[PDB]
Design brief:
Elements: H1 4-16, H2 29-46, H3 67-70, H4 80-94, H5 105-120
Organism: Murid herpesvirus 4
GO biological process, one term: symbiont-mediated suppression of host autophagy
GO cellular component, one term: host cell cytoplasm
């Protein structure tokens, strides 16, 4: 527990940005990326119009303000459902704002802040991790 979610956090991060298959995850850390991914894709497809909320202005400088968007998650309700946006966002920026085939300095911004937030946002303790 603790930073274990970091290595796994980048998994879904790179796994979506096609990076010759990130070779830095446990035998089980791979499956997690599969399950979480299912929720990420479904969240993007289902929740699309609702994204009008504030999924633009903040994504303009997410490189200098990546975690700034993760603050919305822990504003009132940090339920699993609302947490999905955390990982889901990584797929929205990795497949729209950040071209795949390379983990350019950009993609890192996501993982660099993703965990930096998730960490202080240790909510992961409840994040879908039971199956």
């Amino acid at each position: 527990s603790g930073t274990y979610w970091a290595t796994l956090i980048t998994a879904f991060l790179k796994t979506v940005s096609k990076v010759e298959e990130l070779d830095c995850v446990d035998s089980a850390v791979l499956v997690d990326v599969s399950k979480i991914i299912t929720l990420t894709q479904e969240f993007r497809r289902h929740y699309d119009s609702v994204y009008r909320a504030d999924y633009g202005p903040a994504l303009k400088n997410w490189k200098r303000d990546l975690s700034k968007l993760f603050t919305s998650l822990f504003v009132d309700v940090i339920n699993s459902g609302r947490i999905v946006g955390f990982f889901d966002v990584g797929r929205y920026v990795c497949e729209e704002v950040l071209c795949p085939g390379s983990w350019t300095e950009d993609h890192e911004l996501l993982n660099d802040c993703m965990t930096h937030f998730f960490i202080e946002n240790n909510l992961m303790n409840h994040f879908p991790l039971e199956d």
